[PDB]
Amino acid sequence: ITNLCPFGEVFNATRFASVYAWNRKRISNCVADYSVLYNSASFSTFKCYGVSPTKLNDLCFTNVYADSFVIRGDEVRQIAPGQTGKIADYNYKLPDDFTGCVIAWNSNNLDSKVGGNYNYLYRLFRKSNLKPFERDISTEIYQAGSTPCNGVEGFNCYFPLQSYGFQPTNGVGYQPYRVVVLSFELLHAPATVCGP
């Protein structure tokens, strides 16, 4: 296999998904240089689980899944096994036995706009926590108390998604961050994704 893995279209995509509707790209039958990314000064997080980041280029996997979305700076800590909060609980959840890497970088230049970018959403309300790698894109009015809602927004009856408001001079904790989560999958099948 000579062809390079299409990481450019993952990391350099013009637009990223909302976290609640996080995107998944399957990577396979290709060669990828993880070290070039790890050793760059571009990322604020490059932290791996079940595998050493400095050993990634020596390994082969059956599939690599690249999940990507935007959150705000103070939420990057929630993208890890065992974490709690709105993002881990209701939006994107990693398993305890996660084998992969979490990669994040500040995206203020791209994802904020004067006047405010309000297109990136997260789920604020949900009945129960997501299971690992579960995705929820439903938009039913959430009942927060005893009175049924009958689909009517109101007191204790909340639309479940909420926009981030990304404006360029927000504090860093409230600036947008792009996140790529790589899942390294080893099946009972030949490996097709290796380093160089």
Epitope: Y38, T45, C48, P53, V76, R77, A80
Partner: nanobody
Amino acid sequence: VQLVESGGGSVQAGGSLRLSCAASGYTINTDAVAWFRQAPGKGDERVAVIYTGSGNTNYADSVKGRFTISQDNAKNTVYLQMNSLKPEDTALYYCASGYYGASGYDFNNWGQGTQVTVSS
């Protein structure tokens, strides 16, 4: 734990300044503190890192030899001393603390940012 930057301002090219990244608490989970800079037209750059236990330091090539990162654990503060400033050093500078170890790095506690302006 909250991070608060100070020391921002405006100086002319060739000049010098010092930024400070003051932490309110003292978390022991902080293995490293990083200074980033943000400017239009390019991705944010991690220009300097100091490892809290040893004081070892790593710099981006863009600032090596001109910037010095250091730390004072008694004040829970990390400094960035900037000499020989150039206009291309103009940026919003912001600090972060986080994990650094065998699993990689994860700068996930954020300051607010302070502007540095270098004028010809």
